[PDB]
Amino acid sequence: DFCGAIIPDNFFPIEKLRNYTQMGLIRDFAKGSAVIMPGEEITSMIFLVEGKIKLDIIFEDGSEKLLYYAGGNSLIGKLYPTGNNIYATAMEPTRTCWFSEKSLRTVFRTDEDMIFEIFKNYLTKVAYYARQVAEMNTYNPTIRILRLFYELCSSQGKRVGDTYEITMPLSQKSIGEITGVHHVTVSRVLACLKRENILDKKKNKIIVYNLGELKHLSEQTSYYSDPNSSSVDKL
Amino acid sequence: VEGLGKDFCGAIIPDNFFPIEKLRNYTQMGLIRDFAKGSAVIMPGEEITSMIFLVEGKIKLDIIFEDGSEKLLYYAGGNSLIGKLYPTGNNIYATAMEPTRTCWFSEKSLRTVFRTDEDMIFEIFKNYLTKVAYYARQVAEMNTYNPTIRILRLFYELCSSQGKRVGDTYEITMPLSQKSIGEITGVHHVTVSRVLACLKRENILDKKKNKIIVYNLGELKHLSEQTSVDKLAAALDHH
Amino acid sequence: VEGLGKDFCGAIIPDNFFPIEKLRNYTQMGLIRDFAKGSAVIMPGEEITSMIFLVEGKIKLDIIFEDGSEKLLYYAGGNSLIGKLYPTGNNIYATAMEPTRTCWFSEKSLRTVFRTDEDMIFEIFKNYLTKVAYYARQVAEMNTYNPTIRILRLFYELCSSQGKRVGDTYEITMPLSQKSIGEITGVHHVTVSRVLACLKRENILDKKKNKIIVYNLGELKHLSEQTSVDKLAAALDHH
Amino acid sequence: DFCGAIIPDNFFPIEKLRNYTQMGLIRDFAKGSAVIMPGEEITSMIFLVEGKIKLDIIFEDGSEKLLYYAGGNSLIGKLYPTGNNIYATAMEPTRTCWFSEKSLRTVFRTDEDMIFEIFKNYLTKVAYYARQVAEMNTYNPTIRILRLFYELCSSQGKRVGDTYEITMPLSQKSIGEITGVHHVTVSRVLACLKRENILDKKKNKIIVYNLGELKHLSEQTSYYSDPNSSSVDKL
Amino acid sequence: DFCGAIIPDNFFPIEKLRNYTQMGLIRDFAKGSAVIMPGEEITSMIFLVEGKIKLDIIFEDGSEKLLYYAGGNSLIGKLYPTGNNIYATAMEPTRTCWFSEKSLRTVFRTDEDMIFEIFKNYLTKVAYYARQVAEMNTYNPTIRILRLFYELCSSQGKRVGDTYEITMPLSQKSIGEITGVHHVTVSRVLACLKRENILDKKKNKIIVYNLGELKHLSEQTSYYSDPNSSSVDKL
Amino acid sequence: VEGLGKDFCGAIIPDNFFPIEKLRNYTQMGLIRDFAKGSAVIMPGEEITSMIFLVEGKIKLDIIFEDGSEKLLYYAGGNSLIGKLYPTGNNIYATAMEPTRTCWFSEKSLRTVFRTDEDMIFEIFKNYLTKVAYYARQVAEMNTYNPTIRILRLFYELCSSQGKRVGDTYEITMPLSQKSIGEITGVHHVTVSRVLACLKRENILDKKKNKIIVYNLGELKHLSEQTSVDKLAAALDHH
Amino acid sequence: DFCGAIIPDNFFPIEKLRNYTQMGLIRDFAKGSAVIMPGEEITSMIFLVEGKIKLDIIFEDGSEKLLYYAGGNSLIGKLYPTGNNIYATAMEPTRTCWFSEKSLRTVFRTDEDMIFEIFKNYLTKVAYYARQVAEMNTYNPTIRILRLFYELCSSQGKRVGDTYEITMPLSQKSIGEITGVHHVTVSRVLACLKRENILDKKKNKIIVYNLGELKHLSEQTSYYSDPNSSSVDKL
Amino acid sequence: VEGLGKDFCGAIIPDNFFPIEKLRNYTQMGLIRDFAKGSAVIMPGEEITSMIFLVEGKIKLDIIFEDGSEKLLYYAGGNSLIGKLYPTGNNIYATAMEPTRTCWFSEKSLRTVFRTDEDMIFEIFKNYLTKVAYYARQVAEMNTYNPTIRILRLFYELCSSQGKRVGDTYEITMPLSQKSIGEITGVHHVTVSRVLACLKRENILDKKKNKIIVYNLGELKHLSEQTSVDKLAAALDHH
Ligand SMILES: O=C(O)Cc1ccc(O)c(Cl)c1
Ligand SMILES: O=C(O)Cc1ccc(O)c(Cl)c1
Ligand SMILES: O=C(O)Cc1ccc(O)c(Cl)c1
Ligand SMILES: O=C(O)Cc1ccc(O)c(Cl)c1
Ligand SMILES: O=C(O)Cc1ccc(O)c(Cl)c1
Ligand SMILES: O=C(O)Cc1ccc(O)c(Cl)c1
Ligand SMILES: O=C(O)Cc1ccc(O)c(Cl)c1
Ligand SMILES: O=C(O)Cc1ccc(O)c(Cl)c1
């Protein structure tokens, strides 16, 4: 829902995991205690029996941002290392049950259904964050710039061996004014395109060395024009 | 050898989430479906209830928003798994980028796979976890603001000066219309209605005619502490 | 003595646009209507085709937008004229703030006034001109941007590199879809449609399937040179 | 229309004024010439017979902004001084006819209808700019702040003689966070409220000296709750 | 002193004006009271007998800034209207004596010396604020731009009738990068130069219509190269 | 007719501060000195103790800073007065821009003028007041910041939590070294020394080894509330 | 020198390495060619025989910045992986000689002196970049904040078991105003101090849990007060 | 086990650059010196020409700038090497933080070590390379600007419009004074002198009275393309 633009809370609760706490390790955390300490490597699924946990991510510049909140019957799915520094705080008296991989095998040997509850929990999280990323990058500025380039090359691109040449004086200023992107991003992107041998934007000529890549990165979409969309279902 | 994908100018293009070579050994228990270049592997109204394993080929996976905008989520190569075992809120369009062979694993067939090979459970868990880790980091990393949080911030401020603790709730005794909340925070009355509907539904806070009940002050507070991308605008752009 | 209104923190609150004491001498030629405090002098669906002269009292004049938002335009005291002789696009709500006497001058009665007193024409002109001067300055003074201008800017750039002069027009020979224009400028396909509909209607530019005709390059250019307040957002907020 | 958010052009053309050019002064302007020079005091209505004029406003900091464009049959209504420094440029060969007040009397003595055409032209301009100002100030930040104050006083305001007192520690930071307004505006506004004897925002007390004024400036609206709105028409 | 970059206080005290308070009007102001209200037109010199006054200026956007502080024996020199909205506040119990022009004539008829004390007070203020303006505009950005233009014209300016032409593609971006001035100022200035008929900066040509003015505005200085500086004193 | 000067792009170039036509009637009581185009009317080491009245011509008046930088203060035409009757801290260089006649009025000769014409006193007052009004507004109008004010701000903060009122002073009992003050505020130890020397001299505050005495808390506070142009840097640029 | 604030060029040339090119691999690069490609792992010292190389660093956000320029007799010291993505470009026809570790052993077996030339080259680079880092962080903003805290605790810190308490209402706003640091940095730092259990800054109390660490991180310096500085040399 | 140092809020505090355990086996060939807690291992005027190996203990290493400011460069624990074999431009103050044993290796003793163990050469190379990598990244990572680069930018612009190629140089024929260069770029005449002295010394460009010779256009250009921290100010703060 639209609620999830505002509140990241209560992902797919698994009440029934409550019945299997004897196969895990119960751990209690006071208000303000760290369930996951900054830099701690977690290798357990953490079931939230009773209480409230705030779960945040810590970036390499020291900044922290919220990922989500968890309450009764929530599951933190951090069975393996991820590459994200996470920290999590008990915001009230909190009882958890930690499930190691070994302990999970034991649960699923007794109850196969729990495999699929956990899958639903994971899927719910993927669906939510992937959707947010896509919404928030609908107007990604880099892609705006790349799409400009690709479009100019497709109409005005003159082939010259392996390359295409576009004969016009398109300034960086003009690029930023057309796309609506700040000058700093324009330069960065233009520097990337050149050092990677995709495209070099000179003062009165644009050269495209790797149209195929440029096209790739520009993220062309076409469902609505493509014949696939001529019926609701597959052929 | 290969990671998740190549980087261009600071962004990864994921084409290889946590592959599972070993599911090749269990394809006999699923359903093998072949797709020609350009073909739809998943159509946006299609109801998908199978994990889809990529034996050979390459798939482009996009989301389709209700306003008809389309956006790439990821590419999939050999040994990638599309984990769409249950309905999600999202309409997905995925196409074969080249001649492609897939194995579709219903829940029942996965049950069968796991009865033969328990380790496969954790391989699938690993795959899901890479995906959550990737997308959650992508969202958190964005420099974002959200004007609706001004509304939460107002409630938090009023709670901390005027709130009386009743059980595990705080009760604020005052009439504060939706219109007034909008006027103060500079957000449309209709958006304020929706914000307050969410707050109530998710048991954060309920704004009644003459009372505000706060069910989760700590959550309210920390949500209220937040804020390039207007997330409210982004959530609305697609109706 | 009094000007247009008092200032608070850098903003004038207009309560006294160019008064016309002398219209008091011509009220016999109009229609006198009295309003009690709180009463509606103008309702938002009402069709107004009279200039309304304020003999005694005070009026608050607001605009009502289609989404139901309301906003003050001005206050009127004694000797103020409300110049609403013809329909405008705007829905207006005006209320008496105190016991108020008005004289309503239809076109016919104004004809009569001007046959007796020619100078009154220029007094009314003076009043209108103060209003245009005030509001135009208010708009221009705002730090505004408008994302739709990126679309114009694209057309101008393409015209100046690829345009061939035909008569008083410039013809750009290229297919450029609305979808692509949106993608480049980072604005919704539906907004791009509306922008291009305006450009065509107002004889700036017409974007056809394989040709763009530019009817007014100079205007396009200078419009394209533009850009706190997103004017596109402001224009949409009220549906 | 929504077009007018993008294009300020062609306000209410008066074709028929073409028939009265002999009573005015015809003036021709080359491309790039100034029809109205920066700082020039204009006291004439300027009818645009043929061509195109760009009309701009110049601010006291040297900045210039567009007001509008004019073409055939447009009228520039600058019969009297306005307080705005305007400048206007012929963007192509342009023929105009300038009407002094004296000359206008002559026109209206021959044709009374022209009075009302000009009224429509003026009204069209007022309607347009007033509408733009209101749209663009729908979320005016100063008013946001004032509306906060007024609302807190109405619920939590304790009367103390002539004043109302509001006993709470509302920080400037908190004000800006709730309202969404930048700290610079918050201070400016708070300084204005205090020096004008309306309201003084101390650290743990807010005092309102002139509630009536504060209310005034806060721009309360109520059509939709007021009984006036219970029917489409007046009683 | 360097103190005055930090503290604008105690301008040239005139102790002896204390002896002439009977010829003026004594006025007492409580702590927090307004000695000069916002918008009040003052036509009196205000001698500060005892206490402390903070004196500020209010701009047309509602912003206020400090001009200075006054204490015992200070003089506020506001005998005539100035064009500045000033407001001044008693920061403690404060006794003042207000001198109208009539009252000042009476003082100077008794004591001619007081004329010259007041002159010194005025001169001290001029010396201080003029010095601050000059220090703070040592690197004025507009002048940077104008000096660029003037310098390019002096070396590369080719005369073409009344004009000079400079044949080069100097971008606005380049101007801002060389001068260190933000793009917004660059445009504003370039728009001013063009509408005033001084200089028009096209893409591949710069035309200077009024070199003399451009030179004027560029604020050329030359004491150290000029022969005037060849000796400490005049010839 | 003419004001103070012409405007370019938002800035006035003053060439005509409050002229005094009537001093023409009193030149017999001063000393008439003529200057050719390019000539120095005032040299930067010259000690000036006369008001200099401009009978005919035009003068360019600059300040010379100790590092040798030069900057225009104003131009003077006919009927302008240069009010440099006493030494100021400033080194002034003024040159004739054209053939120029001046009348130099010592204090004694002004005494004589005022014995004949009392009104001239107030004319000179008017002239001075225009100058103060102009330059003070110019300074206040600039968007300025000043890092040294961080030091004041620190003292104010410590005073308001730790200060004990003794008479009309506040005493803060704590050792706080100059080095530490610099480190906290991010300003050089040598600048901190100078800041604290000013504060003491001007009777704001005296920072002793183990005590801070604040002589004027209100002034300290409001000075501490302040902050394109770094005024500290500007004050130092000229040694 | 002060030149090195502006120009990072010509670090300690080793002319004599020219004599040992037969023990390395000569490689020639055209103008615009990549000597070190983005993402390339280099494990060789690269001697610059003839030409000019621009050497840059690429950050994880796609931004690139210059490290330095190299010319004849320069040495790029990238014998082992570093953790920095480097790319380097021949800005004219360029001849290099690449020395593997094996090849370097061969050089030093023939000429022991070359070991020490290379040491000087490395030392010159360390001396330069370390000096730049220190200059540029003289007023590090985080440290400003930490030094505030440490100083307040040292004077006003009241011991309470393991902790120190400082009883005052120091706002984040006040912290930023005193230190001169932007609000964003203030929060980030305050969040770091709290999650790391060093210090928690509440509204009316500051608690310091780990004074020793806070002190550590605050970077106290004392050469000039310490007795070590009482003589030029060691005891 | 341990890396280079602990991180606080995004910054590493280096306390352990590339340790060399194996130098413990060669201490007999150096000179063993012991230091008590608080003692100076390196004084700021001391001429250091030895690599200093840390056998046991801990050292704090600071730079002292000419204005007397002091700043930490790094800490050293066991197996750290201080690589100060030759004079650098920097004045270094290093103190024992605890009881500390060191071995000082002159050039001659290192020659001896390398005759016994060739591998030690590359260990020392590794240590130096970690240091360069760390500090260079720290500098590049900072958001910096440098006003002096405006001067380069001016020269580049003039070269690209007016420069005639002579051999491997470009000659610009024009008189452009240092004063004028300052005025244009908004930097002090004295700083401009120093900038131009550097450019000439390092064979970038030589600004003569009526000619500018550019020795390295490509370098000039890319240097000119540059620009929180004013590096010019930072370079000057310490005289
Ligand atoms: O640990 C991560 O990097 C991401 C994360 C956080 C919380 C969770 O419950 C999951 Cl499944 C993943
Ligand atoms: O279907 C979704 O909503 C999102 C999605 C897409 C692809 C995948 O492989 C997964 Cl696990 C989820
Ligand atoms: O009715 C309008 O649209 C705007 C308006 C309102 C009041 C007036 O007095 C005028 Cl001239 C126009
Ligand atoms: O001159 C003004 O200040 C405003 C203005 C400009 C143009 C016009 O056509 C009118 Cl009616 C008013
Ligand atoms: O009133 C002014 O505009 C400027 C001013 C203020 C205070 C004074 O004491 C003087 Cl002489 C002038
Ligand atoms: O001499 C000064 O310091 C400033 C100055 C210059 C010229 C004048 O006319 C005055 Cl009143 C002051
Ligand atoms: O490769 C690095 O990360 C740093 C570097 C670059 C160039 C060199 O010559 C050296 Cl010694 C180090
Ligand atoms: O001494 C210097 O200038 C810098 C320095 C300090 C310590 C070291 O270990 C090195 Cl290699 C260099």
Query: From the alpha carbon of E83, which atom of ligand 5 is closest?
Result: 3
Closest ligand, as measured to the CA of G88: 7
The CA-based diameter of chain A, rounded to the nearest angstrom, is: 72
Whole-angstrom distance, CA of residue B103 vs CA of residue F187:
67
Residue H125 in contact with residue G120, Cβ under 8 Å?
no
Q: How far is G134 from chain H (nearest CA, A)?
A: 6
Cβ-proximal residues to E125 (8 Å cutoff; 6+ apart), any chain: E11, E12, E77, F128, F132, F136
Q: What is the resolution of this structure in A?
A: 2.2
- The answer to whether residue A4 sits within a structural domain is yes
Name chain B contacts of G60, Cβ cutoff 8 Å: 10
Cβ-proximal residues to B19 (8 Å cutoff; 6+ apart), any chain: B77, B78, B79, B80, B81
Quick one: closest CA in A to C225, which residue?
A: A177
Residues B54, B132, single domain; the answer is yes
Domain boundary among C115, C143, C171: C143
Residues B62, B100, single domain; the answer is yes
Residues B83, B18, single domain; the answer is yes
Q: What is the CATH number of the domain that holds D175?
A: 1.10.10.10
Whole-angstrom distance, CA of residue B125 vs CA of residue B18:
10
Pairing of strands E64-70, F164-166: unpaired
Residue F171 in contact with residue F164, Cβ under 8 Å?
yes
Distance E165 CA to ligand 7 centre (A): 49
Quick one: closest CA in D to C220, which residue?
A: D7
Task: Give the amino acid at E80.
Answer: Y
Residues D90, D70, single domain; the answer is yes
Yes or no, beta carbons of G191 and A38 under 8 Å apart = no
Identify the residue whose tokens are 């800490």.
Answer: H75
Residue closest to E64 by CA, chosen among C9, F223, F136: C9
- The answer to whether residue A235 sits within a structural domain is no
Q: How far is G47 from chain F (nearest CA, A)?
A: 42
* C 133-152 near D (Cβ less than 8 A): 133, 135-142, 144, 146, 148-149, 152
Residue F205 in contact with residue F220, Cβ under 8 Å?
yes
Yes or no, beta carbons of A188 and G63 under 8 Å apart = yes
Count A/B contacts: CB-CB distance under 8 Å. 204
DSSP state of B94: E
Cβ-proximal residues to H160 (8 Å cutoff; 6+ apart), any chain: none
Whole-angstrom distance, CA of residue G185 vs CA of residue G144:
11
Query: From the alpha carbon of E82, which atom of ligand 5 is closest?
Result: 3
C-beta C132 within 6 A of ligand 4? yes
- The answer to whether residue D130 sits within a structural domain is yes
Query: From the alpha carbon of G84, which atom of ligand 7 is closest?
Result: 3
The Cα-based distances of A61 to C157, F170, G159, H11 in angstroms read 40, 42, 32, 8
- The answer to whether residue E227 sits within a structural domain is no
Residues with CB under 6 A from ligand 6: E 123, 126-127, 130; F 61, 73, 82-84, 88, 90, 92, 128, 131
Closest ligand, as measured to the CA of F47: 6
Q: How many CA atoms lie within 13 A of G21 on its CB side?
A: 16
C-beta A13 within 6 A of ligand 1? no
Query: From the alpha carbon of F127, which atom of ligand 6 is closest?
Result: 11
Instruction: List the determination method.
Output: X-ray
Residues H112, H168, single domain; the answer is no
> In Å, how far from its chain's centre is CA G65?
14
Distance E58 CA to ligand 4 centre (A): 29
Cβ-proximal residues to A212 (8 Å cutoff; 6+ apart), any chain: none
Identify the residue whose tokens are 């990529």.
Answer: B54
Pocket test for ligand 1, best of B18, B127, B129 (most atoms within 8 A of CB): B129
Yes or no, beta carbons of G177 and F150 under 8 Å apart = yes
- The answer to whether residue G230 sits within a structural domain is no
Residues A133, A39, single domain; the answer is yes
Distance A78 CA to ligand 1 centre (A): 5
The Cα-based distances of F15 to F2, F79, F122 in angstroms read 10, 11, 21
Query: From the alpha carbon of B88, which atom of ligand 2 is closest?
Result: 3
Residues B204, B155, single domain; the answer is yes
The Cα-based distances of H15 to A86, D162, F144 in angstroms read 25, 66, 41
Yes or no, beta carbons of C189 and B68 under 8 Å apart = yes
For atom 4 of ligand 2, the residue with the nearest CA is: A127
- The answer to whether residue G233 sits within a structural domain is no
Whole-angstrom distance, CA of residue B134 vs CA of residue C39:
61
Distance F62 CA to ligand 6 centre (A): 10
Residues B86, B153, single domain; the answer is no
Tokens of G124: 């010159």
Residues C105, C61, single domain; the answer is yes
User: What are the strands, taking DSSP E only, across chain B?
Assistant: 5-8, 11-14, 31-35, 40-42, 51-56, 59-64, 70-76, 81-82, 91-96, 100-105, 144-145, 164-166, 169-173, 205-207, 211-214, 229-230
Whole-angstrom distance, CA of residue A116 vs CA of residue B86:
10
C-beta A54 within 6 A of ligand 1? no
Distance C122 CA to ligand 1 centre (A): 74
Residue G116 in contact with residue G6, Cβ under 8 Å?
no
**SS3 at position A67:** strand
Distance H129 CA to ligand 7 centre (A): 7
Yes or no, beta carbons of E191 and D64 under 8 Å apart = yes
Helices (H), chain G: 3-6, 101-110, 113-136, 141-156, 172-179, 183-195, 211-218
Whole-angstrom distance, CA of residue E66 vs CA of residue E57:
6
C-beta D127 within 6 A of ligand 3? yes
C-beta C52 within 6 A of ligand 3? no
Radius of gyration for the alpha carbons in chain A, expressed in angstroms and rounded: 25
Yes or no, beta carbons of G178 and F185 under 8 Å apart = yes
Q: What is the CATH number of the domain that holds F138?
A: 2.60.120.10
Residue E29 in contact with residue E90, Cβ under 8 Å?
yes
Tokens of B136: 């959650």
Task: Give the amino acid at G235.
Answer: L
Tell me whether B216 touches chain A (CB under 8 Å): yes
Tell me whether H230 touches chain G (CB under 8 Å): no
Distance C89 CA to ligand 3 centre (A): 10
Residues A121, A160, single domain; the answer is no
Domain boundary among C100, C117, C143: C143
- φ, ψ at D204 (rounded to 5°): -135, 5
**SS3 at position C82:** strand
Closest ligand, as measured to the CA of D12: 4
Tell me whether A223 touches chain B (CB under 8 Å): yes
CA angle D87, D91, D93 (to 5 degrees): 115
Give bridge partners of residue F232 from the DSSP assignment: none
DSSP state of B89: S
Residues H155, H205, single domain; the answer is yes
Q: How far is E87 from chain D (nearest CA, A)?
A: 9
- The answer to whether residue G194 sits within a structural domain is yes
Query: From the alpha carbon of A86, which atom of ligand 1 is closest?
Result: 1
Residue closest to D101 by CA, chosen among C109, C4, C19, C124: C124
Tokens of A177: 């004014």
Residue closest to B46 by CA, chosen among B95, B79, B98, B87: B87
Domain boundary among A123, A139, A155: A139
- φ, ψ at C169 (rounded to 5°): -120, 170
Yes or no, beta carbons of F118 and E108 under 8 Å apart = yes
Residue C157 in contact with residue A174, Cβ under 8 Å?
yes
For atom 11 of ligand 1, the residue with the nearest CA is: A77
- The answer to whether residue G5 sits within a structural domain is yes
**SS3 at position G93:** coil
Query: From the alpha carbon of D75, which atom of ligand 4 is closest?
Result: 9
C-beta B126 within 6 A of ligand 1? no
Which of G144, G148, G155 is the closest to F174 by Cβ? G155
C-beta B226 within 6 A of ligand 2? no
Residues D130, D146, single domain; the answer is no
Number of domains in chain H: 2
Name chain E contacts of H190, Cβ cutoff 8 Å: none
Tell me whether F3 touches chain G (CB under 8 Å): no
Residues in chain F: 239
**SS3 at position H25:** helix
Q: B38: alpha, beta or left, given left = phi > 0 and alpha = psi -120 to 50?
A: left
Q: Which range marks the domain in which residue A144 is found?
A: 140-220
Cβ-proximal residues to B43 (8 Å cutoff; 6+ apart), any chain: A228, A232, A233, A234, B93
Residue closest to B213 by CA, chosen among B177, B168, B154: B168
